[PDB]
Amino acid sequence: PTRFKKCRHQRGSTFCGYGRVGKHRKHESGRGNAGGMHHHRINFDKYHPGYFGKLGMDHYHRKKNPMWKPTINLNNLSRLIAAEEAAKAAKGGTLPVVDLQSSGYAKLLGNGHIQVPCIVKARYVSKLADKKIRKAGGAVVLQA
């Protein structure tokens, strides 16, 4: 809305908040990111360390679909089980089955304490996750 802007508060004041000594002029420092090495060096070096240079190897035709690999944690595993099966679950008997690749995940990581034993089907798994789930009472089955 134009009625809330600062220019409506400034009608009658000649300079509009820019001063009589240093006026409001077109481009007093250059256009764009000009001068990042000469006269804007302090700004660049103190707020954006690492802007200039090269690092690492190249990869000419990157495709992200072969690189798809999302992750989920043991203490988060309960989002993928329905409430009734979670209540019915108990170590030593019949456990719920979780399909990570159908739920949208690829790798199982092992942070935290597992809140319910279950059988997990995953493409990948880590050492700690495998060990912890085996101790809890569930199991992990590799899929493709």
């Binding site: 103190k46 707020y47 360390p49 690492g50 802007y51 240079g53 203490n75 309960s78």
Partner: protein
């Protein structure tokens, strides 16, 4: 003329009234301003002060944190006394990382649907502030709680990233762009990770 130099630098910036547009918030403020004026308790004064604050200064709290602090208070309490009422001026959100919790009475401005369901399933009650004003008009036997503020992305961005000792994130949309010069010793220099 009186010499009062630097006397405006003693002035403090407080709020004193709410910017919220919520009629129910206004009704709650009307109740607790009266209570804070006519009652000697400090609980009412603190609650009134926190109802006036902005949304960013009323951070949400978690069910797991509520359970943990309540248990740590309960271990050292007589076996015949009753547990207190957890009070938060803010929202209560759920935690999927904690499955089983005790039965607690909680009062808050808002509950998630999942938080409400979890509390009632465990065996507790979700109260409102007008119900609290009738159960505990002075705030006796209550636990006043606050939610966590650090860990917000804005807080982690505050500062200058290129001065020694500084570990704040830069404002950048490409994650691989600002590495190299000023971040690796192979380039000109690397900013120091520690300073006394």
């Amino acid at each position: 003329g009186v010499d009062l130099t630097g006397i405006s630098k003693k002035s403090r910036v407080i709020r004193h009234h709410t910017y919220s547009t919520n009629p129910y918030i206004k009704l709650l403020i009307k109740l607790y301003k009266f209570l804070a004026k006519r009652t000697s308790s400090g609980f009412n004064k603190v609650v009134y002060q926190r109802l006036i604050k902005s949304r960013s200064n009323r951070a949400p709290i978690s069910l797991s944190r509520i359970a943990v602090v309540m248990k740590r208070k309960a271990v050292f309490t007589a076996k015949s006394k009753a547990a207190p009422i957890a009070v938060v001026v803010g929202d209560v959100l759920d935690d999927v990382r904690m499955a089983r919790i005790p039965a607690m009475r909680v009062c808050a401005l808002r509950f998630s649907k999942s938080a409400r369901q979890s509390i009632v399933a465990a065996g507790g009650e979700c109260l409102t502030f007008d119900q609290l004003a009738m159960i505990a008009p002075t705030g006796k036997n209550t636990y006043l709680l606050r939610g966590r503020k650090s860990g917000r992305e804005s807080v982690r961005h505050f500062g200058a990233s290129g001065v020694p000792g500084s570990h704040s994130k830069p404002y950048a949309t490409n994650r691989g762009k600002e590495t190299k010069r000023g971040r690796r010793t192979g380039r000109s220099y690397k900013r120091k990770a520690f300073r006394h």
